[model samples]
Target: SVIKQEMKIKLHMEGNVNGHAFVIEGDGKGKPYDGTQTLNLTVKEGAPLPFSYDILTAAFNRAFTRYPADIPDYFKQTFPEGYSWERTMSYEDNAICNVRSEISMEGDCFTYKIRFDGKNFPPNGPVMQKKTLKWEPSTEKMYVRDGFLMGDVNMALLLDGGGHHRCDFKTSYKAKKVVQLPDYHFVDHRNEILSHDRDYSKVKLYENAVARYSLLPSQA
Candidate 1:
């Protein structure tokens, strides 16, 4: 009888967040930056399935934040004592928007609530509306090699209130285990993002490096 294969993969995304500037009492500063997310997946061979909203919905929910860096110099005029990056990012005593928002999955779809409302001293605030969006997989620049699957994706959050918030990611699913056949199966191996060769694009190993995950009970 033919045996089955079990593959373990780690899904990851790293990028920056930018679009609208952070504003406070008619004064503005910078937006959030430098973000990364890591999630897990287990699947059989044959090119794992496409990512869904549930995956992304949980990704951001797990993803978590600074400022004065983007704030105008005039901010010092309003409050003689300036704010520190660590202070502005504080949860208990925040100055402006928390910047960190929550997300949830509604059965098959996903929903996110945008927080533009201010903190500390409020001058003008209103009820903010939520934004519902879709998630689609990337196909053009994907590659599989050394049991690692990688792709470049542009995650654009089309916010209804401000405009668009984008996070360009270098996503990868590094295989943790591939039972049976042998190659570079080291669990510690990581992808070389920039200046890497075309090994993943060739697809020879990915096409032929199939594995069998089972054996006779006594033979194990």
Candidate 2:
């Protein structure tokens, strides 16, 4: 007999960026930026061995890799100023707040959905409404490390101008750890990682340090 296991994965992490908040979708009115995303994932067991962690980790990655509409309330509670969540929450044709996302494993794919309620303050008048965005049947496959799954997905953003943002996350059921790589790097970069600017000449040195420090035992 095959046993089916059910579990709920609650993960709290912020969006990946150089600074706090970066421009997501914006128009002339203002710039709409998003940081910090909270995910509630439902994990189901039907797949065979080795692939179990792959499926679970892929489902988690599938949600965070997309564009988030609104700022997560958790950011407000934590580092409000660093993220600039309030400044970019409402702007232009789009004014959204209280964003929530839910992810679940289905078949060989994953289902990602977001529920949000916001207001659109236009020239004519202000309107408040509720909306939902769903991205279904996502077959996402990235770098996997045994029971540990970690990868980075880069997404182009409208940050001032030609900006390329990276979304990186690591999760492991065996180690009971989940982390958004940028958060740690952000702090280190701000604190003491670099005294001046990035050493573009010896960029390999920069990446080598990143690879080493990011895996520091206590940090991990």
Candidate 3:
């Protein structure tokens, strides 16, 4: 007998540094259908700071691409065809230490906001930061554009930082009906692989990854 399955998926991730925090939330529904499975991800973030913009941009990019390996081959195959993701918005302020950034996808979008405490960090560095973001469904392979920085830094340091710091990125996949595979694993193993090469135990890093599938009917 052919089994039919449907899933209502939602995920949330949060990170903190020196009392400052960032959070992300995503929701989607999926199912199996003719030859392919369809998935839709709707993501969002909480309010953020109004001045220090770079931090917010970096945070949103981090949240949007939390799980790169989790994306199926079918989704990656649609890149440069069905959809595209790009940074479409931004805001920044140095005096008050607030920043905001946003990326727009053909079907989804993500945003981030952060506020820094001027009294905490070195006079030249950010003191505190907070961010939030969201995503939508699409059919596209995601790529990190050059000249983009993942951490709280200026453009000049993007290339060097890319080697040491996390980089900003995003992805999107088409909406289609698909069968849910019962025998599937949905955990991020990248950390495991990286752990083998480096001593991650000494430092505190945040991991935010999720896997979600959907089965959409042809008629809908």
Candidate 4:
């Protein structure tokens, strides 16, 4: 019988931007994260909304990406241990500190659900977040990295305008991986992938990634 396998990752990563705590979500186990993935840049300090929002958003855009390996050592610990454990990857524009990853198994194709939590604080204004995030098998052999399949379901972040009272963004992502077999593909724009196939001719399976985002609650 063909065995069924999966890795579901619903990752939540939080950090400080300019001294305020902020949290965002992503796909940890390659569930294609979210569409145009984004985080609300609302700050709790005495700063202008637009400027604060713009810079905070930029720092996140710069720090967030799809490769699990791209994440820090603090964000990769497994199980309940990963929850309390912490680590940091500092940057000139921002500091990602006390990172924690929450993850587990699921009831479907998603074998794991992962979340990353951290703090990001920048000394000044301005930064970047690329939305074209995804993950797949590597171009080379040995699909293993840090003890897990070497892949990234396009980890990415995005943003939009602050509404009357909150921020709403259009977010999307795609991440999929095949184990044991050395599957392959690559992405440039959006979630589009030109793939390779197993011999006997040519074919692809889950030859693409999957993802989406939560909408900001609308005010009445």
TM per candidate: 0.23, 0.22, 0.21, 0.30
lDDT (Cα, tens digit) per residue for candidate 2, span 112-199 = 3333223333323212110111111211123335533333322111222333222222222111233332211211110011111121
lDDT tens digits, residues 1-220, model 3?
A: 0212332323333433334454544333333221122222121332342212222222222222223344443322332232222231211322222223332223232222223222232233322321211111222223222322112212211222232112222222222223121222232211111111121111111223333333343565
RMSD (Å) per prediction: 23.5, 20.2, 17.7, 17.0
lDDT string for model 4 (71-122, tens) is 2222222222222222233433344433333233334321222222223433
User: How big is the positional error of residue 115 in model 2, measured in Å on the Cα after superposition?
Assistant: 1.1
Report clashes for each candidate as comma-separated counts.
Answer: 3, 2, 26, 38
Rate residue 153 of model 2 by lDDT.
28
State the lDDT of candidate 1 residue by residue for 1-220, as single tens digits.
0100121112222211122222111111111121121222222221221211111232222111111232211111211121111001211222232332223322222223323323342122111222413222222133454544433444444444655434344434332223222222111111111221122111110111111212234545
Off by over 4 Å in 4: 1-14, 23-100, 109-123, 128-143, 150-220
Better of 2 and 3 by lDDT: 3
Q: Which ten residues in a row have the lowest lDDT in candidate 1?
A: 201-210
lDDT of 1 at 70: 29
Give the Cα error of residue 177 in candidate 2, in Å: 8.6
**Candidate with the greatest TM-score versus the true structure:** 4
* Candidate 2 stretches greater than 4 Å from native: 1-88, 92-94, 124-183, 186-220
Between candidates 2 and 3, name the one with more favorable TM-score: 2
Model 3 accuracy (lDDT, Cα): 0.26
